[PDB]
Amino acid sequence: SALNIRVGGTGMFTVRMALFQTPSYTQPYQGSSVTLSTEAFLYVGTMLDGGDLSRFALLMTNCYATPSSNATDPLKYFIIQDRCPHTRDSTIQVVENGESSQGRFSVQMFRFAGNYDLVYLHCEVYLCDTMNEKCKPTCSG
Amino acid sequence: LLEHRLECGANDMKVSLGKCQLKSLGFDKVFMYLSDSRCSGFNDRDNRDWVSVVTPARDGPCGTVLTRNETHATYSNTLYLADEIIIRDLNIKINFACSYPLDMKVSLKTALQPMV
Ligand SMILES: *[C@@H]1O[C@H](CO)[C@@H](O[C@@H]2O[C@H](CO)[C@@H](O[C@@H]3O[C@H](CO[C@H]4O[C@H](CO)[C@@H](O)[C@H](O)[C@@H]4O)[C@@H](O)[C@H](O[C@H]4O[C@H](CO)[C@@H](O)[C@H](O)[C@@H]4O)[C@@H]3O)[C@H](O)[C@H]2NC(C)=O)[C@H](O)[C@H]1NC(C)=O
Ligand SMILES: *[C@@H]1O[C@H](CO)[C@@H](O[C@@H]2O[C@H](CO)[C@@H](O)[C@H](O)[C@H]2NC(C)=O)[C@H](O)[C@H]1NC(C)=O
């Protein structure tokens, strides 16, 4: 005979995002508050740190900045809106997205109009399969 | 009435049972196996007395498989139990699964301050 037990559970992959200060993302930033003028660029990369790195590709899908730390603020300045670079700002440049364990991009600095002095960054992340589905962005126009 | 536990960690899954095994059903020794026989159990005394196995959450370390949805990703293996090398009256097994979502919300914890 056989006496079968079926259990369940769940967990999450750890995933992180960090800023950088070079051409090739040499020196990441560790401080808690960054003071840089609007002549300086914002080189930003993401990273997949959990596991199963052999199978899942890291695709950036929605990367936006907001003047408040709370992620659901209605004021959003978009950088990547739907899996594609925003082409209005003529300085945004995306180098790698959807091909490895890290997504990287580059914009120039801004400050929101009105009575605001802080800028926070937020991103959403989709994990696309390297073996089942095409993951590199196709974007024109 | 056999209290199990599950810990679907970031890199590895873990199924563990307590030492009421020595009092339940007369299990004098504990043999614990996975779908691949080379993965076996060990002893765990960190908080209470536990007996556990360890599997990575990938495709084929200890014969775990990836069953994937469009919203989740679920790994699974099957554990085996006995009190002797040969089973004669009860083929006991415990089927487990850990699911993983594919849609993350990561935010940069540090803030900025520009000078115009
Ligand atoms: C994409 O893939 C993911 C990964 O599998 C799916 O997410 C899981 O969906 C299933 C199906 O709803 C969830 O399973 C659980 O089903 C139980 C009902 O079925 C059992 O119980 C009846 C008797 O009631 C039996 O006859 C039957 O044979 C089954 O054994 C529910 O009871 C569960 O609710 C549980 O919720 C949580 C679990 O952590 C606890 O509070 C309780 O234990 C409670 O019982 C549940 O509905 C499973 O949980 C989902 N996993 C998740 C969300 O991580 C997606 O549904 C799928 N998407 C698709 C197909 O579109
Ligand atoms: C983020 O900010 C909003 C308001 O700016 C906080 O309030 C929520 O507002 C939404 C609609 O915008 C409502 O649906 C929620 O019910 C509101 N929640 C509460 C608790 O009032 C929201 O709480 C903030 N998020 C935090 C603090 O995590």
Author numbering:
A (entry chain D): 444 to 584
B (entry chain A): 328 to 443
Which lines from the publication concern this structure?
We set out to solve the structure of the UMOD filament by single-particle cryo-EM. Ab initio 3D reconstruction of 723,000 particles was followed by extensive classification and focused refinement together with the non-uniform refinement strategy in cryoSPARC in order to obtain a reconstruction of the UMOD core at 3.5 Å. The resolution of the cryoSPARC map at the filament core allowed direct model building of the immunoglobulin-like (IG) ZP subdomain folds. Moreover, Coulomb potentials for prominent N-glycans at N396 and N513 were observed and allowed visualization of the core pentasaccharide and disaccharide, respectively. Specifically, the extended linker between ZPN and ZPC in each monomer is comprised of three separate β-strands: Lβ1, Lβ2, and Lβ3 (residues 430‒435, 438‒441, and 446‒452, respectively), where Lβ1 and Lβ2 of subunit n complement the fold of ZPC of subunit n‒1 (ZPC-1), and Lβ3 extends the IG-fold of ZPN of subunit n+1 (ZPN+1). The complementation site (CS) between Lβ1, Lβ2, and ZPC-1 (denoted CSA) is formed by the antiparallel insertion of Lβ1 relative to the ZPC βF strand, and the shorter, parallel complementation of the ZPC βA’ strand by the Lβ2 strand. The inter-molecular interface between the ZPN subdomain of subunit n and the ZPC domain of the preceding subunit (ZPC-1) (interface A, IA), is formed by mostly hydrophobic residues from both subunits, creating a buried surface area of ~2000 Å2 (PISA server, Krissinel and Henrick, 2007). Specifically, residues Y402, Y427, and L429 from ZPN at IA cover a prominent hydrophobic patch on the surface of the ZPC-1, composed of L491, F499, F456, and L570.
The most abundant protein in human urine, the glycoprotein uromodulin (UMOD; also Tamm-Horsfall protein, THP), is conserved throughout Mammalia and produced primarily in the epithelial cells lining the thick ascending limb (TAL) of the Henle loop in the kidney. The protease hepsin then cleaves the CTP and UMOD assembles to homopolymeric filaments with an average length of 2.5 µm in the urine. The results, together with previous data, showed that UMOD assembles to a zigzag shaped, linear polymer, where the core of the filament is formed by its bipartite zona pellucida (ZP) module with the subdomains ZPN and ZPC. UMOD filaments encapsulate piliated uropathogens through multivalent binding via their N-glycans to the lectins at the tips of bacterial pili.
